Ligand binder design. Structure first.
Ligand code: HEM
Ligand code: HEM
Ligand SMILES: O=C1O[C@H]([C@@H](O)CO)C(O)=C1O
Ligand SMILES: O=C1O[C@H]([C@@H](O)CO)C(O)=C1O
Ligand SMILES: [K+]
Ligand SMILES: [K+]
Lengths: 248, 248
């Protein structure tokens, strides 16, 4: 239920130019997964009951980067600082979410609609709102549902974001890619999740929780059979996540 | 601006009986300062922008007792558990605030009006909202003013709560009483604050901040000259603090 704010023509021109520069930079640096993870951890702190947190640029604060769930995301902030400085008119909030949208696009994923106008806010949210990889469906619903206000369909679709990238034992402690093609955005996360553990590939307990839940599991089966349907629901869910607490 | 909830006659009878039992117990155990500090740290987590936190019984949770600002308050919770069990109808929130009101009364202080009907809530607030003793007036206003929504007069009056009790090097790290009579509720905190450091008595940086601020300092002078005026403003401020986020 969104009402997007008006931004000047110069702001809109800067979005379009930054989008292109982000494509080139993210593709060349091979950091699309990290950038997706930065945008998601930015937005995923939203609490709908208090309207605190969410995608309002606070993740660049050292206080929020120190959160253990954000281990490694200081690399992302640093990687983007030279480009952000070329687009001073843009908020950090818009810039990081635009980077997440581009991360998905440049790895072959759906084109997530983007609307500008997030304002940078000065206080990071409390630590502890991001999901815990060792937990299961109840915990997923607590975080995405009770806090962020996303649907069970969004949970499954957004979990397929793991179709790009890898864990790092020096960041979370988990290690390895979810897929055999970690810079390619496709439905492979779901086909691997269904096939069992393969050697070399990662499954978190929070991934496996999707297989045993009666609402999540049919979605997993849908996305593994129908990549177009995964792309549609993913684009819906990403857009919602990127706009949590914004333009309501 | 309060609208107090209706409670049954049995609840009201239990308040009155617990008030008496609290007087006897707190007087005998010599723990009025700790009990005041428990009630204040319960209520002082209130944030008026989000309506989170405040005096709703969450301080008995191990998660909130672990907060470093609450070092030692597990002693208080434990001390009160046998009495609370004699009054099962009462919420923990009402019981702890009633204990704070009695702590003030039984050490000779003003009779703070008490209204029942706080409901126990299940989530403790985030850590870090209670004031920092090494900081000054700006920090006091951030905490009491911007979060809790109390006035500068309340800040000074409520700081005179230090007229009873002591710091402990194994809890905060500070050590000693503010006053020569730490179980007597009087204006002595302000007369000591004005006289300078005396040997054996404690002044926190947050106490000393009251002397250098142009709004706080006249209040300090008022309370040190006029204990009746301290008692009046204290009773006002304590009642407000004990009712933050309650019955609005
Ligand atoms: C469902 C609950 C989730 C849990 C428990 C979880 C947990 C994790 C963990 C532990 C890592 C490894 C971090 C590291 O060690 O480098 C990770 C990586 C990643 N996460 Fe999630 N995550 C969840 C949901 C999401 C969502 C909703 C998105 C985006 C839509 C996402 C995108 C990513 C990406 C792209 C990576 C790889 C990052 C890289 O390669 O640097 N995750 N996640
Ligand atoms: C103004 C900002 C405040 C700061 C920075 C502060 C800080 C502290 C500290 C560090 C201690 C010592 C804890 C220990 O080591 O045992 C303490 C004790 C105490 N505080 Fe405060 N406090 C403040 C306000 C308040 C308020 C508003 C009240 C109640 C109205 C209060 C009541 C007490 C009492 C009664 C004690 C003594 C506790 C005991 O003897 O066990 N304080 N405070
Ligand atoms: O997605 C990522 O990009 C870098 C690296 O893989 C390529 O630069 C990294 O640290 C990430 O987790
Ligand atoms: O106010 C207090 O009561 C006890 C003790 O002084 C008397 O029991 C203590 O640990 C407190 O800080
Ligand atoms: K993939
Ligand atoms: K005293």
């Amino acid at each position: 239920g969104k009402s997007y704010p008006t931004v000047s023509a110069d702001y809109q021109k800067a979005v379009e130019k930054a989008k292109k520069k982000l494509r080139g930079f993210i593709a060349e640096k091979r950091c699309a997964p990290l950038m997706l993870r930065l945008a998601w951890h930015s937005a995923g702190t939203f609490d709908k009951g208090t309207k605190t947190g969410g995608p309002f640029g606070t993740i660049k604060h050292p206080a929020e980067l120190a959160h253990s769930a954000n281990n490694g995301l200081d690399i992302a902030v640093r990687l983007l600082e030279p480009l952000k400085a070329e687009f001073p008119i843009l908020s950090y909030a818009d810039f990081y979410q635009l980077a997440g949208v581009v991360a998905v696009e440049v790895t072959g994923g759906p084109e997530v609609p983007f609307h500008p106008g997030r304002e940078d806010k000065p206080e990071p949210p409390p630590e502890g709102r991001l999901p815990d990889a060792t937990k299961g469906s109840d915990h997923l619903r607590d975080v995405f549902g009770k806090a962020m206000g996303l649907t069970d369909q969004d949970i499954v679709a957004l979990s397929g974001g793991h179709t790009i990238g890898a864990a790092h034992k020096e960041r979370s402690g988990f290690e390895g890619p979810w897929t055999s093609n970690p810079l390619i955005f496709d439905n492979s996360y779901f086909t691997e999740l269904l096939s069992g553990e393969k050697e070399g590939l990662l499954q978190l307990p929070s991934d496996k929780a999707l297989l045993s839940d009666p609402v999540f599991r049919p979605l997993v089966d849908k996305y593994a059979a129908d990549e177009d349907a995964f792309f549609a629901d993913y684009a819906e869910a990403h857009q919602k996540l990127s706009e949590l607490g914004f333009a309501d």
